[PDB]
Amino acid sequence: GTSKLKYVLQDARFFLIKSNNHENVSLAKAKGVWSTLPVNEKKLNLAFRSARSVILIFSVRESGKFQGFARLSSESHHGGSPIHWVLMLGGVFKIDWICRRELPFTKSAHLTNPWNEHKPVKIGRDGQEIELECGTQLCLLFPPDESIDLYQVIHKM
Hints:
Blueprint lengths: L2 H7 L3 E7 L2 H10 L1 E2 L3 H13 L3 E7 L4 E8 L20 E7 L3 E2 L7 E2 L5 E2 L8 E2 L1 H10 L8 H7 L1
Parallel strand pairs: 1-3
Antiparallel strand pairs: 1-9, 2-5, 3-4, 4-5, 4-6, 7-8
Helix pairs in contact: 1-5
PDB class: rna binding protein
Keywords: Fragment, Complex, ythdc1, Epitranscriptomic, RNA binding protein
Assembly: monomeric
């Protein structure tokens, strides 16, 4: 079903995350963490305090797909075990995956982002905010991820 997913996405904010390689998204999916450049880190920390859910939607450059989406569960923090990213970085955000399934860009061609000049939602710099309606519809396009139980996500809201 899609009802708990819709509940998590209610009044959420959405951000496009662009990774230069699959290895970093694999690490993020395995460890439940993300790190970004300080300009985006400041934006995400502000968003985390502002909305019931902040959703990161991941795309590996040149892949032609999104690789899933996750919800911030913390503001960024420093002083953890160093993550072996394949690259100046900021803190580490904890994230809870909502969908680890991929979505090809061909399926999102009807969705444009008003915060990026109404360009197709696949287009955007790392950290580009996606307006609520576009972001909700994009997340709902992904194949359901039956490995994830959103009961655990919901109580953190």
